[PDB]
Nanobody, 116 residues
């Protein structure tokens, strides 16, 4: 009965910021490493960032490092992605995942579109 659902996307200006959320239930969130992955239509899936169960370690992809900040709130069973300095190439559907590799995906995603 694992559930994950993303929220927080929207239409944003270049250089803007957004914060995505992922609400988790049906498993012990605090014991699970979590990740974000994104997919632009016709481009492939791209791993974005991961975080350890405790939040003691995070990792980010070369394309987003230093701009996108993963975090979590274990008390509220929620995963976050603070996206700053948004670029055209960040437009995509974003998905959370309950593993290190952005490969255990349960939600419908949340769309981030950087406006022109």
């Amino acid at each position: 009965q694992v559930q994950l659902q993303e929220s927080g996307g929207g239409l944003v200006q270049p250089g803007g910021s957004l914060r995505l959320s992922c609400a988790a239930s049906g498993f012990t969130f605090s014991n699970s490493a979590m990740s974000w992955v994104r997919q632009a239509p016709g481009k492939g899936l791209e791993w974005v960032s991961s975080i350890s169960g405790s939040g003691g370690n995070t990792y980010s992809a070369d394309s987003v490092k230093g701009r996108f900040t993963i975090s979590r709130d274990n008390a509220k069973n929620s995963l976050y992605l603070q996206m700053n300095s948004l670029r055209a190439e960040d437009t995509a559907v974003y998905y959370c995942a309950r593993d290190w590799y952005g490969m255990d995906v349960w939600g419908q995603g949340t769309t981030v579109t950087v406006s022109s």
